[PDB]
Every structure is written in C-alpha cells, then in structure tokens.
Design a binder for this molecule. Structure first.
Ligand SMILES: *C(=O)c1ccc(-c2ccc(C(=O)OCC)cn2)nc1
Ligand SMILES: NNC(=O)c1ccc(-c2ccc(C(N)=O)cn2)nc1
Ligand SMILES: Cc1ccc(C)cc1
Ligand SMILES: Cc1ccc(C)cc1
Length: 9
C-alpha cells in the first residue's frame, strides 16, 4: 500500500 501511494513522489 505504501508503495502504491509513494509513486506520487
Ligand atoms: C503497497 O503498496 C505494497 C506494495 C508492495 C508490497 C510488496 C511487499 C513485498 C514484496 C516482496 O518482494 O517481498 C519478498 C518477501 C514486494 N512488494 N507491499 C505493499
Ligand atoms: N515518487 N517517486 C519517483 O519520482 C521515482 C521515480 C523513479 C524511481 C526509480 C527508482 C529506481 C530505478 C531503478 N532503475 O532502479 C529507477 N527509477 N524512483 C522513484
Ligand atoms: C491495498 C493495496 C495493497 C497493495 C498495493 C500494491 C496497493 C494497494
Ligand atoms: C506516504 C505519502 C505518499 C504520498 C504523499 C503525497 C505523501 C505521503
């Protein structure tokens, strides 16, 4: 999950 969001940065 964290990676899924982290792609934004
Ligand atoms: C949430 O975005 C997210 C993305 C990816 C993963 C994840 C966990 C484990 C592996 C892996 O190769 O583990 C080997 C034991 C890859 N990706 N978790 C959460
Ligand atoms: N918000 N995230 C980003 O902007 C971002 C963009 C690119 C990358 C990235 C990481 C690893 C490799 C590689 N070839 O290992 C290439 N690109 N990581 C993060
Ligand atoms: C809830 C969730 C789990 C894993 C990824 C890659 C994305 C979202
Ligand atoms: C964990 C996280 C992901 C994305 C933003 C924009 C901020 C924090």
């Amino acid at each position: 999950l964290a990676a899924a969001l982290a792609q934004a940065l």
